[PDB]
Write a protein that binds this ligand. Structure first.
Ligand SMILES: Cc1cn([C@H]2C[C@H](OP(=O)(O)O)[C@@H](COP(=O)(O)O)O2)c(=O)[nH]c1=O
Ligand SMILES: [Ca+2]
Length: 129
């Protein structure tokens, strides 16, 4: 897998972001995680976390996995990186997302994320508190 450029267009919520990719505006859904909806507990915190991470970043990159690149809703499915840091991993390490939606063709970074979840679980962070 390889990272490709994109630019922030706008924050949406904890696990969705509007990015420009290959010149075209697109909503991206972060692979392999589930943040709470904005109206759910830790939802606002998740949205804030991802907004800031993405806003502050000098450089956003997308990384498609091996499978499906767009979901049923037209959202691109990728891992997102902000200055080389995976947003999934950051969210999951803070207990602001669960590992989730792990489908067979598109699960390259499962265990990395699971490892992060375990440490958030142990620290009883946020979702785990
Ligand atoms: C993360 C991800 C979600 N989805 C779809 C499954 C879910 O369908 P349903 O809408 O039918 O529940 C929905 C969850 O996304 P959200 O958590 O953004 O709502 O998005 C995929 O199809 N592939 C994926 O890799
Ligand atoms: Ca969600």
């Amino acid at each position: 897998l390889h990272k490709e450029p994109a630019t922030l267009i706008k924050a949406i919520d904890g696990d969705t972001v509007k990015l420009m990719y290959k010149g075209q505006p697109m909503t991206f859904r972060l692979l392999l995680v589930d943040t709470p909806e904005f109206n759910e507990k830790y939802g606002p915190e998740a949205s804030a976390f991802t907004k800031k991470m993405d806003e502050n970043a000098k450089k956003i990159e997308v990384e498609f996995d091996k499978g499906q690149r767009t979901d049923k809703y037209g959202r691109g499915l990728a891992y997102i990186y902000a200055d080389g840091k995976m947003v999934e991993e950051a969210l999951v390490r803070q207990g602001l997302a669960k590992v989730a939606y792990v489908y067979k063709g598109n699960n390259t970074h499962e265990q990395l994320l699971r490892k992060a979840e375990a440490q958030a679980k142990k620290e009883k962070l946020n979702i785990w508190s």
